[PDB]
Structure formats: C-alpha cells, structure tokens
Amino acid sequence: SKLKAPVFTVRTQGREYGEFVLEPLERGFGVTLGNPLRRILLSSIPGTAVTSVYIEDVLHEFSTIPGVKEDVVEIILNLKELVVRFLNPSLQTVTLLLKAEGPKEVKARDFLPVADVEIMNPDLHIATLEEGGRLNMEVRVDRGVGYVPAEKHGIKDRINAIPVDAVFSPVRRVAFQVEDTRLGQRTDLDKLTLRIWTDGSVTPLEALNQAVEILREHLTYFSNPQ
C-alpha cells in the first residue's frame, strides 16, 4: 500500500512564467510541498536589482534634472523596476552607464550594452527628456537576496552617488494548486501544480530548483543532534 514516485510535468511560457505539476501525491502533501517552496521562492531566491545611482549634476535623490520630466526620485523609482540578468553566475556586480539628450524618451534600451549582461525589460521608461535636456548617469546593479533598504547597504560608488532600494528577489509571484486525483484503487490523493511568475532574470524552473536545494539544505541542518 506504499505510493510510488509520482510524475512531474513542466509547462513554461517564456522566461517569466512556469507551471510545475506533481501527481499523484498522498493526502496532505499538496500544500505540504506547495507552501514551503513558495515561501523560499518569494523570499530567499537570489536575484539582481539596482543598488546604486549616480547622475551628473545631481547631488542627491531629491534633486531634479534640467530638461528631464521625472525627478531623480521618480527616476530611481523607475530604475527599481529594472530587471538585470547576469549571464555569468560568478559575476555579482555591473555598473551600467547611460548618456542621452534631445527630445527623446530614455528607456532601458539606452543602457550601454555590457558583456554577459541582459536587460529583460527594454521598454521600461526611466525618464523623459527635452530640447536641451541632458541625462548622464551610472547605475550600479548588484546580485543579492530578498529586499535590502537604502539605509542598510548604503551603496555609493562615488560621493554624489545615491543608495537605491534593492528588490533582489527575481520572483514576482508564487501560487500552487491542490487538485483531487486518484490512482484507481485509492482516491483523495493530492495533485500539485506550482505556478511561478518571475521577472525573467531567472527561469521559474531555475528558481524552483534553487528553492528545492535551499529547503533540502535546511533539512541537512537537521542532521546533528545536541
């Protein structure tokens, strides 16, 4: 009467969204597996976010740039939405530069292309410029975990640099469905379906595997009694 190894299906849509089915599971295992993985996903999945920002002729975050619609505050707010994918795992910091002028709309595309660096959302409008409007800035994007306030890390590449709130966690949303399934002889068995919305810097499959490894490691922590 021992339940063998259930099947595991994968249905992903691009790099942002992924579905992960596991069935059949014994009664109770649907959320028993579904929830902790979710927690680790939303919380402790390593990612990337803008940690620093320096704009020329801008002394602080609450300054406002001539010829630029958005103030440095709102500009940084837009920069927090920047999804930066690091191609190389060993790399942990990239300083993207941006020089723009004239009646143009600065987006994530205008970021100078860096080797093994991929901006996932190019259509992200950072700031609107004007005839005579000059936007020259260097933003520092680091790799970290979870949420780190500007008061915490306080990353400043230079003097006029501005610490930016880093939302490292690439995972945007996690759900999981428990459905009624049977094996013919026995019923009421649980069927898991993990839904993962990610920013694109990491694949839902990748993030799920990382969460799995984290949970497993945390189980390894239960090995030595004292």
Binding site: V31, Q177, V178, E179, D180, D190, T193
Partner: peptide, 11 residues
C-alpha cells in the same frame, strides 16, 4: 484560472 485549465484548489 478557468481559461488556463485550472480547476478549484483543494484548499
């Protein structure tokens, strides 16, 4: 949820 092909959660 109904469009994707998802039933109702046991929860």
């Amino acid at each position: 949820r109904k469009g994707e092909g998802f039933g109702v959660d046991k929860r």
